[PDB]
Amino acid sequence: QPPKWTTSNGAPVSDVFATERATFDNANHANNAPKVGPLLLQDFQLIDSLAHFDRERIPERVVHAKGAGAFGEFEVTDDISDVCAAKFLDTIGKKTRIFTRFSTVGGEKGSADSARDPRGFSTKFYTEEGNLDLVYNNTPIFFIRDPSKFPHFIHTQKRNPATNLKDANMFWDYLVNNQESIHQVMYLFSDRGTPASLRKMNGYSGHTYKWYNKKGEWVYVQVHFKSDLGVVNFNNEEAGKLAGEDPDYHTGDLFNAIERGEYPSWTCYIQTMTQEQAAKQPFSVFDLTKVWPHKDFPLRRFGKFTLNENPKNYFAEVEQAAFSPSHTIPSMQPSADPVLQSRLFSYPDTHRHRLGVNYQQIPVNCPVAPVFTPQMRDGSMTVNGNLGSTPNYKSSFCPFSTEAQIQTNSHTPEEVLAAHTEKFHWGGILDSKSYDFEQPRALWKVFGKTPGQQRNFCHNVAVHVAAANHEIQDRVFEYFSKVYPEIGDQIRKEVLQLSPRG
Amino acid sequence: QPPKWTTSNGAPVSDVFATERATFDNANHANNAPKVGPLLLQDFQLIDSLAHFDRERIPERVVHAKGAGAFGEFEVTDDISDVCAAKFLDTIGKKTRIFTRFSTVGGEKGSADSARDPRGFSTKFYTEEGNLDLVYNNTPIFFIRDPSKFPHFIHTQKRNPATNLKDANMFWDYLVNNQESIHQVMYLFSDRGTPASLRKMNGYSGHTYKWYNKKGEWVYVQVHFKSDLGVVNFNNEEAGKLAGEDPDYHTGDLFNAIERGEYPSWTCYIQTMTQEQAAKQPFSVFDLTKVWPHKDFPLRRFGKFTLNENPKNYFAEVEQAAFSPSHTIPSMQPSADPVLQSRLFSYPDTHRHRLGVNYQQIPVNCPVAPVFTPQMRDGSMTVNGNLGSTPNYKSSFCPFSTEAQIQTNSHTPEEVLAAHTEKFHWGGILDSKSYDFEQPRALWKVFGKTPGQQRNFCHNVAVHVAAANHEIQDRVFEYFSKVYPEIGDQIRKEVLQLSPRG
Amino acid sequence: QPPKWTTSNGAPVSDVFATERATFDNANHANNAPKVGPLLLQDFQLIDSLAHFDRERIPERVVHAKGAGAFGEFEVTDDISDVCAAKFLDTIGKKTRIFTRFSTVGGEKGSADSARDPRGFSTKFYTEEGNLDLVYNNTPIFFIRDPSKFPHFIHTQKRNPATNLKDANMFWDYLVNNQESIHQVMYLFSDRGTPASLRKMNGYSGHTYKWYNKKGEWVYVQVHFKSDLGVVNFNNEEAGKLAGEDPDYHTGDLFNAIERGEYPSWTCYIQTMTQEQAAKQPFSVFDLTKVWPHKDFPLRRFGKFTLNENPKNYFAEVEQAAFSPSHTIPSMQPSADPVLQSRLFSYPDTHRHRLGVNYQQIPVNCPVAPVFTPQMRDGSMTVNGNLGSTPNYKSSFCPFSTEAQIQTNSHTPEEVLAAHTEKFHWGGILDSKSYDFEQPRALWKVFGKTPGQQRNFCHNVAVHVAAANHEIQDRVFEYFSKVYPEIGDQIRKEVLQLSPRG
Amino acid sequence: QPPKWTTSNGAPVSDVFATERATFDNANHANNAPKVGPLLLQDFQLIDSLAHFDRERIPERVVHAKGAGAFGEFEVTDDISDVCAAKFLDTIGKKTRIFTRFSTVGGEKGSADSARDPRGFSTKFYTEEGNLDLVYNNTPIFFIRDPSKFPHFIHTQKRNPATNLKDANMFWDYLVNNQESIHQVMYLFSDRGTPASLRKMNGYSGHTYKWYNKKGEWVYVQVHFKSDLGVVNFNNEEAGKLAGEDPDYHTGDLFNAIERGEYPSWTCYIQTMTQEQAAKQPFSVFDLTKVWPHKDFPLRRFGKFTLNENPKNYFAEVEQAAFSPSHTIPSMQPSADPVLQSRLFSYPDTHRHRLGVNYQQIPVNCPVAPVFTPQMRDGSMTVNGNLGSTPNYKSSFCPFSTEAQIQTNSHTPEEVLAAHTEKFHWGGILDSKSYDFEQPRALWKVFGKTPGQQRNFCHNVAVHVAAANHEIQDRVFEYFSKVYPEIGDQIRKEVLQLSPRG
Ligand SMILES: [Cl-]
Ligand SMILES: [Cl-]
Ligand SMILES: [Cl-]
Ligand SMILES: [Cl-]
Ligand SMILES: [Cl-]
Ligand SMILES: [K+]
Ligand SMILES: [K+]
Ligand SMILES: [K+]
Ligand SMILES: [K+]
Ligand SMILES: [K+]
Ligand SMILES: [K+]
Ligand SMILES: [K+]
Ligand code: NA
Ligand code: NA
Ligand code: NA
Ligand code: NA
């Protein structure tokens, strides 16, 4: 009943550790016990094992490398089929399997779980119509609304190219010269930048999406996932201490929660707005640096999910999980958010580099809907039979069905094109008085409704910018003072204690 | 009933061919029917299909790239358990599933099946004790007995580095300076170099292996797979005409034979010799350029196999098939043939590069025996679950079994070592009088027993070496004359007609 | 002095072929000359050499795998700065270094040069504004005008998924159900499908491009490279016979021409038309299955190029060469031809798969213009220094320049957009009377201007389609009848000779 | 003049952040400034940039992933040509460029530089006879003397397969069941396990090597690199506190020292013994868990080196640095140390996976000696010319030189072989009285020459093993008691304070 140890080709071994050698004769030695001589090329059992060891590592995710995952279940609790025709949403009580990967953004594989960063909150829905990936963050906004900036931004959040050190000069240099970032910089430097538990943070679509009901009518949609335990944060000092005591604290917190039977859960809501309402708003629905104010666009519950099952093997199920915003179902479509648009290409592109072209044959990534793609064949590590003899083009010798086209309803026309295609840069140095700082001003007031939050924000910025040199510091005070002047000045005063000038 | 056409994530499509575009207004045009404008990045269906198309190709085999394959069944017909304790051999009537790949050596993926070359004949036995790969050729000898020469030799059989053309001058320059090659050269240029059908040629281990019985006694073994249809060949002109009319002839011949129920079959024999017999022979059992004479080491039948099932998908089952001499079972071990010894390393090495580290999880390569390698984990495209939570070392928390070592019997000791390790080159320029030219002379005598074979052999060499320059041609005549001077002169005469001088 | 033979780390070897072994004692053997025993893992020279050998192969191009190349020189011979501000065109007599690769389409790397196929004619211009790639074929049209059809089409031109054989049934099944293919199909089965020499064929942009002058005015453009030796073709039987005798005929022809100094050269022309002209045509300038009639849009010479330098290493310069339509200069832009659009993505995508992310650091692919991409860093096999310590974002610490944007002149506006984005399928079954069959009828009349070309065309089709089943054959006869009924009947008659019915 | 920002193909860009879109008409909106619509596939500048970003990451090293490096200079100070004929040692004052990489072992990228671990101390010497890699550690011993154990051991030093957390249970389960490990375990849990600075640690060959002089006489060698600043360590609490404050401390420490001209240096010594002396010792020179006592084998100085130049780009020079013990020069050979032997295969094996087959063409890895390997050609990312048209085998048409064989002097013959090859396991449960515990007892006494070192050792273990379960704890106490019982008692006392029992 105990399994036989083997080689990769399945032949039983007789000793796990012994290896083959042309023994030297040492019988006359003071210590003749060893049997030692040059190793032999024919020791398959050894070379098999060393060559596999030598290839264990695959490239880490270019961002969001450090992660933790679980499986679970999503359940419809309200009817929203007036908004969305999705089959997994079409019945109250209908359940769907999910897999979630939580992550930080900037850190590599050995980095701390408690670092200041946005958190990835990425969920795969295994539906009867295909795998739906909701690739969300723990924040409803982001630093950019121009997709060309992401390599620049991410570089400045990581390490200097000569030293391999983190560098506050470049970190802040990028942000003060691309000032659309300020809304998410404030959220990042609140205490939500250091959640106390992955079970105690929210997820947000961030982007606007477009959902279609069975009549072909579409609305714009924001999605909100709210922890049933609420948002609970560490502060800057707690998080930094924990980084040196348990860099894997959140991984274990989630795992142990699930082993105990204390399954974390989330409630799911949408905001919706019509094209006619969008035209009336002071912000674009395509602007990822904006939220939709709750008073004008209230949240509407539609479901809940629970993570109740730890992975059996982390590398196979978590490290190898692939999520893409372009993995959708017919009723849920991307908006023209420039950042989302670029994400549609970027995830599959990176997946093919990191995992291989057939990465969706890896079990965690397999759809449960039947996949039928006759024209997509071969590629490295084809393990699913490659559709056998099925013709590999749209053929007369093989029948198939297509769906009927979701025809857009005249009641809700698609957006009308302007007269030409153009290039556009939606960013840079912005005016203090424009609506681009009004949401950051609103975030400051939201801080002020909870005692301690404004002071923590200013302290969290100061300990970080104190490391940058004095000229960058000054640009940073101006930058926050474009929100409210008192913010930049409270930060300047604390930075001057930490970083003296004389 | 017909399957729905989908994308890679399982989402049904509505149109197989339509693609998204920012349409230009052409309503006032002379022909206003087209709807054309710049393509949109958000067309996942399209980009999904093209990105997969762009990665269809995996690297081809460095040698033996062009092949054909079939599944079948091997059956024990005689008891040789006195020679070999293998479980798949341990009962007359016992059947084992097999997979065979046939191939040429030098040619690439679109080369002619009917070209002059050795033919590969590699079979995977899916046994209870693991996958046994018998990686054989259609010749019992080979060009080399020094492993370092294989890159040298193979390069001269392929293309000039500057022109990408075949080059008679390097082809023959290699051979006349490494004269251990002549035995296999004569076989190559006999009509067996152009088999009429893969169902009508033999397979041979070529190397000596060492097989062990339940008592731990071992003997040297040569293996012979003889077609139940006999050896049937094309002549040089048939084979060359076919290169242009049907370069896939053998591939279709095998496939059609199986489709119509004419299942090809082979009978399996061994030759055996003890260490005491080996010590008396004029040749080394470790010399791949040597056969064992039949009158002295007669063939002993043990089984048969039949290829009776075509692949469903050529790429997934044939192009991804991986074979290695070092994939064996405990009762069958390699001898110290230096060429075989380096093949133990080179095939798994090249497999990892061509297919990926986990290529034994591709279905055709999967063992049917239970595989248990707790210390070999992760790597690209882990699709078998990666052993779940099983500890990844030899641990107390997880019990396992090993086999008992096959203790070598004092009645057949292992070979005794000399005093020191050393470096050795077993080739180069050789003496006409030595035993290294004796088995070539015997092959000449064997040609002579069938009318036309001696004539054809000289013709087959002549047409090839006439493309070399005159100084090389001279060395070639001189090389064949080390066998019998009649041979070199007979070839010189015909080469002079084809390649006039002065 | 002659160089020292080394290992890969530069250590001089003492013997090229000797290898290290734990020698067996065979002093008492009849033949004791061998020094043979198991090979040692510590033989770096052996293993280093075999491990490299094991990794020689990279994936072949998914199409156009079989190819031949040469470096040369483009020279401006007429001033066209009224049409195009490209710097490499800005002076009569300006010389630019080029690299050209020719190829077939469906054949793999070992396949026949003389096969019936379109030929690729791809040229890289190393200009002071960047590397411009003109990725052209030897035909001015192509089988598709929907980018999604390419994988389907190419698959049908290649091998059956189960048998790995070419398959006339799928070949013609695709063509007869996607009837826009017929113009290029007729070009293919003319004798231009079997050129006698890469030196004796033309190149064509095929797609419409859009070229801009210093004022921002733009015109649609078609480029023609006409061989100074004119177009010379084999007939079907010569090509088939040469497939068997010299599958590398074209490669040797090109190489030997340059070796002996008979440098091939082409003369370069453009056709041009304005947006206003385009609106009057019965064809779209975005339709790759269409040409521009010569008497309406006459050729205008602008230069010439000569191929005068053979590669020194085929693998390093030809096999690793990478071309993309999206590698362009600022004054030359793509049109909304839907096929050309998808090619902008597909080629850099497949390059990263086939060659690695940093394939443009491979010497043949390097630009001679200074590259400065601070935000594009790292990746496998960074060999160019990786910009040293240069910041990896757009920074205040590193000064840089950007050119000015070519502002589109109000004289020649960009194309106006329609109201909405949409999905379009530009093909399928077409009406015989429509203009989609008019340019095919004209090609027939061009064939008629030369005795035998019409009958040769029908013969070339018949011998190919005779292999397909009788239901496919029937569809093919109607297909060609849609051009003119006499064509379908001529082909039916000969196929009946070859493929009897009764 | 400042450089022009370009695309990868060298075309200058006009704007660094603007991207193309099919703009939606929002002229009527409350805020009509945005120009936003779906992104275009033809935006090469964007897709080029994103596709490169998507591929920045290569696999991290399977071990020693976290690292820091610098260039420098080695200088001969004393003559040892009586021991070694290396050309780089043959003259007093001779200088050789070096590159050094330091690293931890277990930690991934992003982990703490201050972690308890061995330190990699790895150095590449660019000699005129080839690149010599001295792949050393900061300890003269290691955990194993059986190569098959390295994957087991490393796995237990890293993360649990299910949770992805470090696991003290598997960490100690491996060590107490393979008790040859204890010598290095004591060194690891001394304060040398947490150096204060990479500049303040020693390096050691660990393995015995064999060095040959010009007469062919060889001795066994051990190499010692002693920091000119001495060995300076943190205590456990300092190490841990620093992990949270500055996980990149050692990296910055080395960089800034060099930046400010405080170049670290090391003095280089050897121990040597003849085969005659080795046969008298209580330990095998092939045993990596042993040192040579200084009193019997005193250090002999021969040179020094200084790190005086920081890398310009960390990824290109440090991350892509590749070292291997089998990169050597003819006068420096490996011993039959079983661990060392397996390292000769394993490092190039992983290099080809991690960096590609042609990784020695990456600048930091290039030899400065002329490399000439005609039989090693092609492969992915061939960037050095591939030897042009040089023949790719040992050819009559290319002259070359080989060096003379260093023929072993009969005054120092090679080791004599026993009768047979065999398999062997040199570890497991060991007897307390055997010599395998003598050097650990001696290390205990070394600790006791300095106040508090014995107590710090026990504390450093106890805080680690306190996290294991009580049965594993009990086994750790017995394990250390096999050295001296007082050691286990002390550890048990402190563990009980941290891990109380009922
Ligand atoms: Cl406050
Ligand atoms: Cl590899
Ligand atoms: Cl004859
Ligand atoms: Cl890729
Ligand atoms: Cl004590
Ligand atoms: K948002
Ligand atoms: K495809
Ligand atoms: K043989
Ligand atoms: K497609
Ligand atoms: K055209
Ligand atoms: K040692
Ligand atoms: K090689
Ligand atoms: Na011994
Ligand atoms: Na239209
Ligand atoms: Na001998
Ligand atoms: Na606008």
- The secondary structure of A448-479 as a DSSP string is HTSTTHHHHHHHHHHHHHTTS-HHHHHHHHHH
Looking at CA atoms only, how far is residue C6 from chain A in angstroms? 22
Of the candidates C155, C154, C63, C159, the residue with the CA atom closest to the CA atom of residue C104: C63
In one-letter notation, the amino acid at residue D452 is G
- Other Cβ atoms less than 10 A from the Cβ of C295: the count is 5
How many whole angstroms separate alpha carbon D375 and alpha carbon C50? 10
* B164 annotated ligand-binding residue: no
DSSP string, D57-89: --PPPSSS-SEEEEEEEEEE-S--TTT---GGG
CA distances for B299 relative to B95, B265, B270, B293, angstroms: 22, 18, 6, 10
How many whole angstroms separate alpha carbon A217 and alpha carbon A85? 10
CB B74 within 8 A of CB B93: no
Q: Give the three-class secondary structure for A72.
A: strand
User: Cα torsion at C55, C60, C65, C68 (round to 10°)?
Assistant: -30
> What residues pair up with B195 in beta bridges, in sequence order?
B233
How many whole angstroms separate alpha carbon D465 and alpha carbon D169? 8
In one-letter notation, the amino acid at residue D306 is T
Of the candidates D118, D100, D108, D120, the residue with the CA atom closest to the CA atom of residue D61: D108
How many whole angstroms separate alpha carbon C218 and alpha carbon A175? 39
Examine the residue annotation and report whether B137 is marked as an active-site residue of this protein. Answer: yes
Q: Which residue in chain B has the smallest CA separation from D421?
A: B417
DSSP string, D162-225: TT-SB-HHHHHHHHHHSGGGHHHHHHHHSGGGSBS-GGG--EE--S-EEEE-TTS-EEEEEEEE
How many whole angstroms separate alpha carbon C351 and alpha carbon C327? 12
Q: Give the three-class secondary structure for B70.
A: strand
| Residue D90, C-beta contacts closer than 8 angstroms, at least 6 positions apart | D81
Of the candidates A104, A335, A140, the residue with the CA atom closest to the CA atom of residue A220: A335
DSSP string, A194-257: SBS-GGG--EE--S-EEEE-TTS-EEEEEEEEEETT---B--HHHHHHHHHH-TTHHHHHHHHH
Four-residue CA torsion sign, A176, A180, A182, A188 = negative
- Tell me which method was used to determine the 3D structure: X-ray
Taking each continuous run of H as one helix and of E as one strand, the counts in chain B are 13, 12
| Domains of chain C, each with CATH number or no CATH | 1-502 (2.40.180.10)
How many whole angstroms separate alpha carbon B288 and alpha carbon B184? 10
Of the candidates A362, A45, D147, the residue with the CA atom closest to the CA atom of residue B373: A45
How many whole angstroms separate alpha carbon D272 and alpha carbon D266? 20
| Residue B364, C-beta contacts closer than 8 angstroms, at least 6 positions apart | B99, B124, B316, B317, B318, B320, B321
How many angstroms does the Cα of residue A23 sit away from the middle of ligand 13? 8
How many whole angstroms separate alpha carbon D120 and alpha carbon D195? 12
Q: Which residue has the tokens 């594989």?
A: A109
Burial of B432 (0-12, 13-18, 19+ CB in 10 A): middle
> Nearest-5° angle of CA A149, CA A152, CA A158?
135
Query: What does the DSSP 8-state code read for residue C162?
Result: T
From the list B131, B137, B213, B236, the catalytic residue is: B137
Ligand nearest to the CA of B448: 3
- Other Cβ atoms less than 10 A from the Cβ of D410: the count is 8
How many whole angstroms separate alpha carbon C133 and alpha carbon C135? 6
Four-residue CA torsion sign, C353, C356, C361, C364 = negative
How many whole angstroms separate alpha carbon B69 and alpha carbon B317? 8
Question: CB-CB: which of C38, C130, C403 is closest to D9?
Answer: C130
| Gyration radius (Cα) of chain A, Å | 27
Q: Give the three-class secondary structure for D412.
A: coil
Question: Which chains, if any, share at least 3 CB pairs under 8 A with chain C?
Answer: A, B, D
Structure tokens at A10: 């399945």
Burial of A13 (0-12, 13-18, 19+ CB in 10 A): buried
Burial of C221 (0-12, 13-18, 19+ CB in 10 A): buried
CA distances for B467 relative to B117, B263, B462, C22, D7, angstroms: 17, 41, 9, 43, 49
Q: How far is CA B363 from the centre of its chain?
A: 20
Helix, strand, coil % over all residues of chain B, rounded to 5 = 30, 20, 50
Q: Does A400 sit within 8 Å of B3, measured CB to CB?
A: yes
Backbone angles phi, psi at A447, to 5 degrees: -50, -45
How many whole angstroms separate alpha carbon A131 and alpha carbon A326? 10
Return the half-sphere exposure (C-beta side, CA atoms, 13 A cut-off) of residue A385.
9
CB C331 within 8 A of CB C211: yes
How many whole angstroms separate alpha carbon A31 and alpha carbon D286? 12
How many whole angstroms separate alpha carbon B336 and alpha carbon C22? 10
Helix, strand, coil % over all residues of chain C, rounded to 5 = 30, 20, 50
Q: Does B4 sit within 8 Å of A400, measured CB to CB?
A: yes
Q: Give the three-class secondary structure for D18.
A: coil
> Nearest-5° angle of CA B325, CA B96, CA A42?
20
Structure tokens at B253: 């011949």
CB D271 within 8 A of CB D299: yes
- Report chain B residues whose CB lies below 8 A from the CB of C194: none
Structure tokens at C232: 């010379």
In one-letter notation, the amino acid at residue B85 is A
How many whole angstroms separate alpha carbon B84 and alpha carbon B210? 9
In one-letter notation, the amino acid at residue B195 is P
> Nearest-5° angle of CA C226, CA C229, CA C230?
55
How many whole angstroms separate alpha carbon A347 and alpha carbon B51? 12
Q: Give the three-class secondary structure for B40.
A: strand
Q: Does B49 sit within 8 Å of A376, measured CB to CB?
A: yes
How many angstroms does the Cα of residue D478 sit away from the middle of ligand 5? 16
How many whole angstroms separate alpha carbon B489 and alpha carbon B482? 11
Query: What does the DSSP 8-state code read for residue B374?
Result: T
A interface mutation test: which of C392, C424, C476 has the most A CBs within 10 A? C392
| Gyration radius (Cα) of chain C, Å | 27
How many whole angstroms separate alpha carbon D426 and alpha carbon C458? 78
Looking at CA atoms only, how far is residue D397 from chain C in angstroms? 12
How many angstroms does the Cα of residue C56 sit away from the middle of ligand 12? 8
Ligand nearest to the CA of B33: 14
- Report chain D residues whose CB lies below 8 A from the CB of A337: 36
CB B179 within 8 A of CB B186: no
Burial of B91 (0-12, 13-18, 19+ CB in 10 A): exposed
CB A80 within 8 A of CB A91: no
CB B207 within 8 A of CB B335: yes
Of the candidates A154, A54, C386, the residue with the CA atom closest to the CA atom of residue D319: C386
Q: What is the resolution of this structure in A?
A: 2.3
CB B128 within 8 A of CB B88: yes
Q: Which residue has the tokens 């950042």?
A: A339
CB D111 within 8 A of CB D258: no
Q: Which residue in chain A has the smallest CA separation from C421?
A: A417
How many whole angstroms separate alpha carbon A278 and alpha carbon A220? 9
| Residue D486, C-beta contacts closer than 8 angstroms, at least 6 positions apart | none
